Symmetry: C3
Subunit: 92 residues, 3 copies
Amino acid sequence: MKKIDAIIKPFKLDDVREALAEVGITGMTVTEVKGFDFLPKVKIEIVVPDDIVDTCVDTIIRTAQTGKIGDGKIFVFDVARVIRIRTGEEDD
Amino acid sequence: MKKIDAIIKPFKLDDVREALAEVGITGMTVTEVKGFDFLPKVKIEIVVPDDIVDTCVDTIIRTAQTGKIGDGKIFVFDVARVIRIRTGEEDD
Amino acid sequence: MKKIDAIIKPFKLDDVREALAEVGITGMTVTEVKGFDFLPKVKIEIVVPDDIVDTCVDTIIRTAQTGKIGDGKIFVFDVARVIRIRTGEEDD
Ligand SMILES: Nc1ncnc2c1ncn2[C@@H]1O[C@H](COP(=O)(O)OP(=O)(O)OP(=O)(O)O)[C@@H](O)[C@H]1O
Ligand SMILES: Nc1ncnc2c1ncn2[C@@H]1O[C@H](COP(=O)(O)OP(=O)(O)OP(=O)(O)O)[C@@H](O)[C@H]1O
Ligand SMILES: Nc1ncnc2c1ncn2[C@@H]1O[C@H](COP(=O)(O)OP(=O)(O)OP(=O)(O)O)[C@@H](O)[C@H]1O
Ligand SMILES: [Mg+2]
Ligand SMILES: [Mg+2]
Ligand SMILES: [Mg+2]
């Protein structure tokens, strides 16, 4: 699986959530951050299966972009293990 | 080494800290986050040696779980380098 | 590219920003975090080309250190993909 970090404009969060939900991604973690005096941003983190990474990245690009400055970046990371606390089950 | 991200219920932080301290892990970084309208969560990040990753994951699972919905996830990442700012010493 | 996470004392942020700007690094994401009852810290995240990782790490070490306790750590991660939301262009 991969972790996708998207740093976006705060008012683009509901756009991105809505569009991701359409391609079936709903679980996400959101952090308030400062982007560099600074601009408030939100950091979206979602961990998804490898075969939907492209769909997710593309979806975030399409929805979060304004064509203007400050639209933000997407960072994708390899994830070694994913464990559910409820059950102890590993990876997904 | 590995970085362990645990997204948990906020009132489970002291449980997890206490239990980790028992197996000798005390250094951690904590972030307030929103989990998906949303529920407040805390993100615990700890960077540990490879041979205690299992112990830590298991400890977090045992302490943070409620058997119910919302218990959260653990994400484990490879860490390329770990440097101490005090001394410049690399990895651990 | 690599992602560099530096957990530092909050009043060291402008020091680090200023010094990084000198070696040409200006884009960064900053998060308020708690370091372990706890001390307020700031988490700096910057994603940089491989050949300036050493320069950046060294710069953060030199500027952020006080020689005393609590100076913090630098964690370096491999980054699979970096995508700009404005253009959809991948990696850098
Ligand atoms: N190297 C980096 N490390 C961590 N975060 C970054 C980095 N570069 C940019 N960011 C985050 O991205 C935000 C700015 O995005 P950016 O302005 O680069 O968008 P863009 O898609 O390149 O559009 P434009 O270039 O037109 O502004 C910053 O607020 C910052 O939080
Ligand atoms: N794909 C993901 N990316 C980032 N964060 C996530 C992801 N999935 C879940 N989370 C975080 O985990 C929290 C929810 O955990 P979750 O409800 O999945 O726990 P669980 O152990 O699966 O228990 P249950 O399935 O019974 O709820 C969310 O609030 C969110 O912050
Ligand atoms: N294993 C870890 N995982 C995540 N964050 C950590 C970890 N260890 C330390 N940190 C972060 O680093 C901060 C403390 O840094 P630390 O005190 O280790 O600095 P140092 O350079 O080792 O100096 P000294 O050892 O003299 O205090 C903590 O507040 C915490 O947020
Ligand atoms: Mg909107
Ligand atoms: Mg409690
Ligand atoms: Mg200062």
